[PDB]
């Protein structure tokens, strides 16, 4: 179970067999290649199909991978694994990680020279519901933008236990499919140039070798890649994708998205794999698939008569408002070089019989879209089609594979696929659609799924002319409310020329590419209506299904929302529903919210340009109170380095009283909130009551989309007012329904967002945003309003454009034009590892609410380096990167395996280098150690106060000091003592005394703690919330120690204690319990005997009868008879040895002598040898030389001896060189795993 892998050119993309650098003499790229062996000189054969892709890695739970990388390239490269655990020796990234230089070699590997080692623990592998093998990847992490854009990306396959099973190696196949865009003009090698959308690195259908056998099934480990946004809707001509366990028509992928999809190949032949996004640039993503041979009640028949035929279509049957400094006019009003609102288009139209002389029932609300075509699995639909147009059209369904002609099976001419065969203004065709099983749902997804048909003789301009209609596909009014999101591009519609004649003053005025006229016919439509012309009446408590399609120009995804409402997606209640082009989803919701609402787009610059419509519904134990206001602040998006402009923002904060004056300051548990509002947490069935007061210059609003208004005011439909004026104080109250909260199959606590909605886009960038947790059942309680079983954090990913933030004109504060220093890629408003507040206990679930908001660019691909988490929607799937889309607020949980300081990135390479990053600290709760305060390791000069009474100097505050005057003391009321630890440290507690003066008892009965990082940024330790601040209980007398603990441990280097109640006089001796940042201070078990006597062994051991000084007993502070180790003879060649059984990171050695009889023995000088095997040895050299370590000066006092820079080894020997009277050792070892 030790799998060894030996990973380590010119490429034109179409010419296969350039990977023959193995062995034929006929752009600069650096890729991953394999090797046979540990001697780095022998190339392997790599398959045709893998192309540029790095070696596929296969393993299992509980194994260990051992890669050896050797850099043989111009530039440096690292090896960064995704979705496994590693030791910091293996992270292949460099940043402010507080990491020894030995553990930073991985961070950058120079030409020549690195093994990595990854762990795959039990908690790392897939669950029962997951695919048999999770799809991950690995890359160089020295310059993401550069490294990816140059060819550094391979596949990572993490399967559950059971790879050594005899797979039928006729099937299987299972080809990783990297879908990587490469921007060859911004890779390492260069000096714009071009940007290649590829499949496995080949363009224009050229990928060789992807052949699969017929009546079997093929799995697909799918990896997207790319260094900007942009999405891809990936299809396979005659075929469906199965992902998680859902029938999906496209694959929804986007930079570093990872899937395992499987599909099933029923038709022999060759089929086009291709991305379907309108932007023809996207048109390198194209590959062929060949499928071959290898070795060894009662179903209805529905009849529909449908005609293509032309009509005048009105996008706005409700007059707008001539006022044209507000675009509205241009797209719809009539006049000069503007058409208007009546465009001639062609539709699908249902008729009643073969005569086509009388029309079936039209219906307002479904405008433009053809007749509703229902059909359960098994049925047949006879779509009798008659043309009646001018151009030759057609009708064909995207979704069903088996669509042949009726009666005959043979096609009229040289027609490859019926798709491009036209129908002739006056012909009839007879089609047989047969709905089979492999088109339908899959138990785990909803009853019906939403598809569509359209003409395909010229796909583009036919759909653009208006040939579209809905097709449901289900399992064994009626079917109603169909919502079609459709940008109709009238600049391609066949009837462009005819329209000009009828609707213009003079067809003379040509212009044709005048971009105002062109962009005046891009009606951003819902169904067929625009700028609020599609009004649709629903009732109250109507349980309604919604069938939703995205077919149009569009190009970019749509992020669709209903105001005030919450639909059911994947058997889970969500709030926005992201839809790729040519994609359709079914949602289901109950109309429980009276009011007038707006359906619309959220995508910024469709929505303004018309894509609206109105929803008009109308009929036909505790109370948890939060006090929250919108207040203005200053904000620098990150101070640390880089030339420091400050920006005016506006933010949500929590207050205590109705009298908004005491602001309930936060810290530790909520420092991270940043620009974000406070956590407002409720359980289910209790009530939420938010009193909201607008400070701020402008007016703002409190909207969530959980806000449920009651059935007041019966006269009509009502636009919900909202709109809090800059000083007014509106109050919202609403009960929380079981449907606003976690399903029994989700996590204990669901997250929902909340913000202003007086200008959706502009005033999020200004800063109004916060998390609204909805916890489950009886989990969240106490007087804390929180789970407390789990540490919870909220991370809001977005790219603030301070040019769009309202207060931007108020920031004339600079002095007297490109924006790229006014944009910040900022998690919660901090950029570049600047975000504070992320402290988490060793082993202890942590729940992360992740939100993105804003413009289309925000398709962030969030990675937790070295960790994995679990997402839940009806079942539980392991993942390593969640592909956060704007408006979606997912909830995932992880436990942190390994101690240290770890990075939270956005794997969008551009975003990362633009600052979108931070870190968190995971500490061991078991690393409490004295910071050297009593032991004098902290030299006197670092303690510091502010007044001294007299001779009672702060340099005396040292626990256990004795005599006379023996402490700090001050007669000032407001005083403080301040300790400079000399570097950032982790503090878990503080032990506190106070001395005696002649006959009085002096002590602090009540203090407070301040700490600081720089030395003038002190903050009060409001530990564990409690109130305005933590009042600590001091002592009761001289002698006793009071051991307060810091259970959100203090991260600081200056700590400062403020006495608030003393007896007679503030007077203090103290000790600081703590740990270094990397948690390397604890014993490795000498004192706890955790190292059984068999692991300790030495070169000799004096024995006679009455003594027996065997190594086993040489443990620090052991007492009694014969309490230490004595070599059978004294000489500087002897050594004592300890087999740790594992490699350890030894960072020091405490060391002791022994009292015995009367003659005192201790070791003045020693040296240290180390080994990985137990038969080879090396002395710990340093700065040149064989170190000689100082020794004890007495036979009772322990002395520490830090090892710098600390050695790694599993074998440790101590070589005493010079001693006193006799060699005698007791010791502890300091370090960690």
């Amino acid at each position, epitope marked *: 179970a030790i799998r060894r892998y030996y990973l380590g050119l010119s490429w034109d993309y179409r010419q296969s067999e350039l990977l023959r650098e193995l062995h034929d003499t006929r752009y600069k790229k650096t890729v991953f290649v394999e090797f046979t062996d540990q001697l780095f000189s022998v190339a392997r054969p790599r398959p045709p199909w893998m192309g540029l892709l790095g070696p596929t890695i296969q393993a299992e739970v509980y194994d260990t991978v051992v890669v050896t990388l050797k850099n043989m390239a111009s530039h440096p490269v690292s090896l960064h694994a995704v979705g496994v655990s590693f030791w910091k020796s293996s992270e292949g990234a460099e940043y402010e990680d507080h990491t020894s230089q030995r553990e930073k070699e991985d961070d950058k590997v120079l030409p020549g020279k690195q093994t990595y080692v990854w762990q795959v623990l039990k908690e790392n592998g897939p669950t029962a519901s997951d695919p048999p093998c999770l799809t991950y990847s690995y890359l160089s992490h020295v310059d993401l933008v550069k490294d990816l854009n140059s060819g550094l990306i391979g596949a990572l396959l993490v399967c559950r236990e059971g790879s050594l099973t005899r797979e039928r190696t006729q099937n299987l196949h299972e080809f990783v499919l990297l879908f990587a865009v490469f921007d060859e003009g911004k890779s390492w090698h260069s000096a714009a140039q071009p940007a290649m959308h590829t499949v496995n690195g080949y363009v224009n259908r050229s990928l060789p070798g992807l052949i699969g056998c017929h009546k079997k099934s093929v799995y697909w480990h799918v990896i997207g890649m790319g260094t900007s946004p942009e999405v891809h809707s990936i299809f396979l001509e005659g075929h469906t994708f199965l992902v998680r366990h859902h029938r999906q028509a496209s694959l929804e992928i986007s930079p570093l998205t990872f899937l395992t999809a499987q599909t099933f190949l029923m038709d022999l032949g060759q089929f086009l794999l291709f991305c379907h996004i309108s932007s023809h640039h996207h048109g390198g993503m194209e590959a062929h698939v060949r499928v071959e041979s290898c070795a060894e009640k009662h179903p209805k028949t529905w009849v529909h008569y449908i005609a293509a035929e032309e009509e005048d279509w009105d996008y706005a049957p409700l007059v707008l408002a001539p006022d044209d400094r507000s675009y509205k006019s241009q797209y719809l009003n009539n006049g000069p070089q503007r058409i208007g609102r009546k465009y001639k288009k062609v539709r699908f139209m249902a008729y009643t019989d073969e005569t086509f002389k009388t029309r079936e029932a039209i219906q307002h609300e479904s405008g433009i879209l053809g007749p509703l075509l229902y059909g359960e699995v098994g049925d047949t639909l006879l779509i009798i089609f008659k043309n009646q147009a001018s151009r030759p059209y057609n009708i064909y369904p995207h979704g069903i594979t088996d669509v042949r002609p009726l009666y005959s099976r043979r096609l009229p001419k040289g027609v490859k696929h019926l798709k491009d065969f036209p129908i002739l203004p006056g012909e009839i065709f007879k089609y047989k659609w047969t709905v089979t099983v492999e088109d339908g749902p899959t138990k785990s997804d909803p009853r019906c799924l939403t598809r569509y048909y359209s003409s395909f003789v010229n796909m583009e301009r036919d759909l653009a002319s208006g040939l579209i209609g809905p097709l449901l596909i289900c399992y064994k009014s009626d079917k109603r409310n169909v919502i079609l999101f459709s940008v109709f591009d009238e600049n391609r519609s066949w009837y462009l020329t005819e329209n000009i004649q009828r609707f213009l003053p003079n067809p003379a005025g040509v212009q044709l590419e005048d971009p105002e006229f062109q962009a005046s016919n891009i009606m951003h439509s819902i169904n067929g209506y625009v700028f609020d012309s599609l009004q649709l009446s629903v009732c109250l408590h109507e349980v309604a299904y919604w069938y939703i399609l995205s077919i149009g120009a569009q190009t970019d995804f749509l992020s669709v929302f209903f105001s005030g409402y919450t639909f059911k997606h994947k058997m889970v209640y969500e709030d926005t529903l992201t839809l790729f082009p040519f994609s359709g989803e079914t949602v289901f919701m109950s109309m429980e919210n009276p009011g007038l609402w707006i359906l619309g787009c959220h995508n910024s610059d469709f929505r303004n340009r018309g894509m609206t419509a109105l929803l008009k519904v109308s009929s036909c134990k505790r109370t948890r109170h939060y006090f929250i206001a919108a207040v203005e602040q200053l904000w620098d998006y990150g101070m640390s380095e880089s030339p420091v402009p400050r920006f005016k923002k506006v933010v949500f904060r929590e207050f205590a009283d109705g009298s908004f004056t005491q602001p309930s300051y936060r810290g530790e548990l909520n420092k991270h909130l940043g620009l974000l509002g406070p956590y407002i947490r409720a359980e289910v069935e209790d009530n939420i009551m938010v009193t909201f007061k607008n400070q701020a210059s402008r007016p703002y609003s409190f909207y969530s989309s959980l806000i449920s208004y009651p059935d007041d005011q019966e006269q009509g439909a009502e636009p919900r007012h909202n709109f809090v004026q800059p000083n007014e104080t509106r109050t919202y109250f609403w009960k929380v329904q079981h449907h606003m909260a976690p399903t029994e199959d989700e996590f204990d606590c669901k997250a929902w967002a909340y913000f202003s909605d007086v200008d959706l886009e502009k005033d999020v960038h200004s800063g109004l945003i916060g998390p609204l947790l909805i916890c489950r059942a009886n989990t969240l309680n106490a007087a804390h309003g929180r789970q407390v079983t789990v540490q919870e954090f909220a991370l809001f990913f977005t790219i603030f454009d301070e040019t769009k933030s309202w207060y931007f004109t108020e920031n004339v504060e600079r002095n007297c034009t490109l924006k790229e220093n006014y944009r910040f890629h900022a998690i919660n408003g901090y950029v570049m590892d600047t975000l504070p507040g992320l402290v988490m206990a060793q082993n202890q679930r942590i729940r992360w609410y992740l939100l993105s908001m804003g413009s289309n660019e925000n398709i962030h691909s969030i990675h937790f380096s070295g960790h994995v988490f679990s997402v839940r929607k009806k079942e539980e799937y392991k993942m390593a990167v969640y592909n956060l889309y704007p408006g979606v607020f997912e909830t995932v949980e992880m436990l942190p395996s390994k101690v240290g300081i770890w990075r939270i990135e956005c794997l969008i390479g551009e975003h990362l280098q633009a600052g979108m990053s931070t870190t968190f600290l995971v500490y061991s709760k078991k690393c409490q150690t004295p910071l050297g305060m009593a032991s004098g390791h902290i030299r006197d000069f670092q303690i510091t106060a502010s007044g001294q009474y007299g001779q009672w100097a702060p340099k005396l505050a040292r626990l256990h000091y004795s005599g006379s005057i023996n402490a700090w003391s001050t007669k000032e009321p407001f005083s403080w003592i301040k300790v400079d630890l000399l570097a950032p440290m982790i503090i878990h507690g503080i032990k506190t005394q106070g001395a005696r003066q002649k006959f009085s008892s002096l002590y602090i009965s009540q203090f407070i703690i301040m700490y600081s990082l720089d030395g003038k940024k002190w903050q009060t330790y409001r530990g564990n919330s409690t109130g305005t601040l933590m009042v600590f209980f001091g002592n009761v007398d001289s002698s006793g120690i009071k051991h307060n603990i810091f259970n959100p441990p203090i991260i600081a280097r200056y700590i400062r204690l403020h006495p608030t109640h003393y007896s007679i006089r503030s007077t203090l001796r103290m000790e600081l319990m703590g740990c270094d940042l990397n948690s390397c201070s604890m014993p490795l078990g000498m004192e706890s005997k955790a190292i059984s006597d068999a692991q300790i062994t030495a070169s000799s051991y004096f024995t006679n009868m009455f003594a027996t000084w065997s190594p086993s007993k040489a443990r620090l502070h052991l007492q009694g008879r014969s309490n230490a180790w004595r070599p059978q003879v004294n000489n500087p*060649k002897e050594w004592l040895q300890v087999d740790f059984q594992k490699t350890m990171k030894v960072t020091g050695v405490t060391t002791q002598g022994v009292k015995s009889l009367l003659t005192s023995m201790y070791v003045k000088e020693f040296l240290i040898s180390s080994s990985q095997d137990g038969h080879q040895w090396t*002395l710990f050299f340093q700065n040149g030389k064989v170190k000689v370590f100082q020794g004890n000066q007495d036979s009772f006092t322990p002395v520490v001896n830090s090892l710098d820079p600390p050695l790694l080894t599993r074998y440790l020997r101590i070589h005493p060189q010079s001693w006193v009277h006799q060699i005698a050792l007791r010791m502890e070892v300091l370090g960690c795993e």
Partner: antibody
Amino acid sequence: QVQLQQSGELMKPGASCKATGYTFSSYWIEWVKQRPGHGLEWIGEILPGSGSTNYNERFKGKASFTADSSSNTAYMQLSSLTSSAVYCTRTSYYFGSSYDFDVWGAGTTVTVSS
Amino acid sequence: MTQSPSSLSASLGERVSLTCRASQEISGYLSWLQQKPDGTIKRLIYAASTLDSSVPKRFGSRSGSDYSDSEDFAVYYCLQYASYPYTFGGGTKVEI
């Protein structure tokens, strides 16, 4: 292949070990001055990787210990000679190994007269 | 550290005499070597009862507090490696 050496001279009374094939620093070296007719006594152990030395009561005033790392050589200096002998060796820093006095010195001539 | 009888010659392949006696208790840390006339010094016995590398397998015993054909002409000195300062031996002279 473990080998030793010593530069093979005299002077008047009253006047002021190379090895290859192993690790020069992480092994002790020992000097010896076998007096004529008697036997072999003891000088001091030099650790060429640090400088730790344990001299002998006799040559305490005449057994100084110097060396150089990036050369793999070790010398010995004595002041004021007396009117003469003929005769280094290697010991390990840990107990257990067999690299203890395995290879011996190459011998050197030394005389004190006028 | 002396030798006994420090002078008992022989020839080639019989029971001669070459035994070492220590001042104090050493326990294991004794050796025995050979001196060639031109200055060549080798090693054989070490750690009481243990064999060497480039030396044949014929020589070797120990007991608290004492311990121990071909080119047979040397002065066998023993070695004491139990505590500093170290010391060799007296010398057992032989001649053919």
